[PDB]
Amino acid sequence: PIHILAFPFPAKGHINPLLHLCNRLASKGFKITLITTVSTLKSVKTSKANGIDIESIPDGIPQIITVMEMNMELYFKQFKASAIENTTKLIQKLKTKNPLPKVLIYDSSMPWILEVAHEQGLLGASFFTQPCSVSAIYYHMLQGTIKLPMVSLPYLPLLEIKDLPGVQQFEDNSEAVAELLADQFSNIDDVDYVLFNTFDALEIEVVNWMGSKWPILTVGPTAPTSINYLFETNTEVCMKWLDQREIDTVIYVSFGSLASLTEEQMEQVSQALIRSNCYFLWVVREEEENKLPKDFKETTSKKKGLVINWCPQLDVLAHKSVACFMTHCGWNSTLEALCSGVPMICMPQWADQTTNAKLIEHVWKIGVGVNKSIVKREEIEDCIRQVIESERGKELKRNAIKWKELAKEAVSEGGSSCNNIQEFSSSLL
């Protein structure tokens, strides 16, 4: 049995898509060892079902994402040095056990792990967790074609400056983040396999352009559109609440695993959802409850809402009661919603979320965007009415369903992503 090592960047939007790919590979008979930091493992609550081996390495910085943002340039470099040393030591240990590791799939944000793989005699696969269109922008930043602070780039829609990946939002971490994004392509010619969590039909032209430079493998959605979650997802509570809701009546709301809204912005969102008279399921992370309005969680949301610190997002987006998804437009949420046929209300915050919202609204045509003044309740209510009631909203739903069907083709036999995972799997045999 071929033994695959997997090393995501320590954040849920990087762990989860690689985990789903690992589950697909394990179903084809590969042994998987998933390398997590101690900080990630502390939140891991369920993994006996997975049958994947989990091996921990130290965080490598003081006690992990929240330490990192205090000083991105320094602490990302300390994380890098520690991870290079600790993954080397772990691989040395795994080389004393059968089956021996053959390949290391690592997050594309850590391109320097390629040199660890090759030094240890492993193949290296860089796993890109953002779409081809956004990754192309990072390639152009590495080339100096573009510097991030109307924009035409090959095979991308014309973009406003607001649609470029947002790094100014990180203030003093701005420059450090821009260099890290561009670094994803710093050794691409030396990578053994280039894996993208997308499917061809979603971005035909830029995928074709990319494939003219390097052999790339589109293998997405990796999510299985359970063994599906590592972290606490409150599945029973969420799914029983959804099961009491009628078709097309629920606004699912989530800003992902990282982004945080100000107390004032949360007030705007809370009131927009109440004045809307729709049922809503709003993921508010535990460390972000306290910025909700006074009696919001315990009383005023009780009639129409479920406010929860984490949900089983794949199961929620697959539920017929969900009519639309108010999202920060992180790539996993965008692709999971698209593959589930769920139209979106885009409220992007930073990095690739800005560009994803543009693709959602103007290319794939499965969502509407809010306009800032902060984003006010009336703006949110207006977007909800657009999606939930208006004729335009029915068009967005039909478009989302057409993409769901194309994504279903891509991952089924003979589809582009199924074939590419097969090709990857065969190359290892």
Ligand X SMILES: O=c1ccn([C@@H]2O[C@H](COP(=O)(O)OP(=O)(O)O)[C@@H](O)[C@H]2O)c(=O)[nH]1
Distance separating alpha carbons of residues 75 and 421, to the nearest angstrom: 34
Nearer to ligand 6JI, 345 or 351 (CB): 351
Q: Which does 331 bind (CB under 5 to 8 A by kind): ligand X, ligand 6JI, none?
A: ligand X
Using alpha carbons only, what angle is made at residue 147 by residues 144 and 152, rounded to the nearest 5 degrees?
85
Under the binding rule (CB under 6 A), the answer on residue 336 touching ligand X is yes
Site size for ligand X, by CB under 6 A?
19
Judged by CB under 6 A, the residue of 177, 251, 261, 326 near ligand 6JI is: 177
Any contact of residue 257 with ligand X (CB under 6 A)? Answer: yes
Point out which span in 50-58, 99-107, 132-140, 254-262 binds ligand X (CB under 6 A).
Answer: 254-262
Stretch that binds ligand X, among 76-84, 101-109, 305-313, 372-380 (CB under 6 A): 305-313
Distance separating alpha carbons of residues 132 and 97, to the nearest angstrom: 37
**Residue 152 burial (C-beta neighbours within 10 Å; 0-12, 13-18, 19+):** exposed
Tell me the window of 61-69, 143-151, 192-200, 396-404 that interacts with ligand 6JI (CB under 6 A): 61-69
Residues in 347-366 at the binding interface with ligand X, rule: CB under 6 A: none
Q: Which two tokens stand for residue 184?
A: 């994803």
The only residue of 111, 165, 330, 348 in contact with ligand X, by rule CB under 6 A: 330
Please select the residue that binds ligand 6JI; options are 112, 155, 170, 209, rule is CB under 6 A.
170
Contact between 314 and 226 under an 8 Å Cβ cutoff? The reply is: no
Among 21, 136, 178, 180, binds ligand 6JI (CB under 6 A): 180
Sheet with 193-196: strands ordered across: 53-57, 31-37, 3-7, 101-107, 123-128, 193-196, 216-218
Which is nearer to ligand X, 309 or 422 (by Cβ)? 309
- CB distance 336 to 225 below 8 Å: yes
Strand partners, 31: 3
Q: Which is nearer to ligand X, 124 or 256 (CB)?
A: 256
Would you say 64 and 37 are in contact if contact means Cβ atoms under 8 Å apart?
yes
16 makes contact with ligand X (CB under 6 A)? yes
Told to check if 181 binds ligand 6JI by CB under 6 A, we report yes
Nearer to ligand X, 2 or 258 (CB): 258
From 34-42, 174-182, 261-269, 403-411, give the range in contact with ligand 6JI by CB under 6 A: 174-182
Q: Which stretch binds ligand 6JI (CB under 6 A): 63-71, 143-151, 268-276, 325-333?
A: 63-71
Selected range binding ligand 6JI among 169-177, 187-195, 271-279, 418-426, rule: CB under 6 A: 169-177
- Write out the binding residues for ligand 6JI, residues 351-390 only, by CB under 6 A: 351
- Characterize the bridge pairing of strands 250-254 and 216-218: unpaired
In the complex with ligand 6JI, the residue whose CB is nearer, 258 or 401, is 258
Q: Closest distance between ligand 6JI and the C-beta of residue 337, in Å?
A: 20
Specify the 3-state DSSP secondary structure of 304.
coil
- Per CB under 6 A, the list member of 38, 44, 258, 318 interacting with ligand X is 258
Minimum CB–partner distance for residue 330 and ligand X (Å): 2
Within 211-270, the residues that bind ligand 6JI by CB under 6 A are 258
Query: Are 72 and 170 contacting, i.e. CB atoms less than 8 angstroms apart?
Result: yes
C-alpha to C-alpha distance for 220 and 58, rounded to whole angstroms = 30
Q: Where are the alpha helices (DSSP H) in 311-360?
A: 313-317, 331-340, 353-358
Longest dimension (CA), the chain: 62
Q: Is 191 in the site for ligand 6JI (CB under 6 A)?
A: no
Q: Tokens 């003081």 belong to which residue?
A: 62
Q: How many whole angstroms separate alpha carbon 18 and alpha carbon 16?
A: 5
DSSP E strands in 48-108: the ranges are 53-57, 101-107
Binding mask 6-35 for ligand 6JI (x = CB under 6 A): ---x-x------------------------
Residues followed by a break in the chain (C to N exceeding 2.5 Å) are 63, 149, 225, 373
Q: How many CB atoms lie within 10 A of CB 191?
A: 22
List residues near ligand X by CB under 6 A. Answer: 11-13, 16, 233, 254, 256-259, 283, 310-311, 313, 330-333, 336
List of residues contacting ligand 6JI (CB under 6 A): 9, 11, 65, 68-69, 72, 109, 170, 173, 177, 180-181, 184, 258, 351
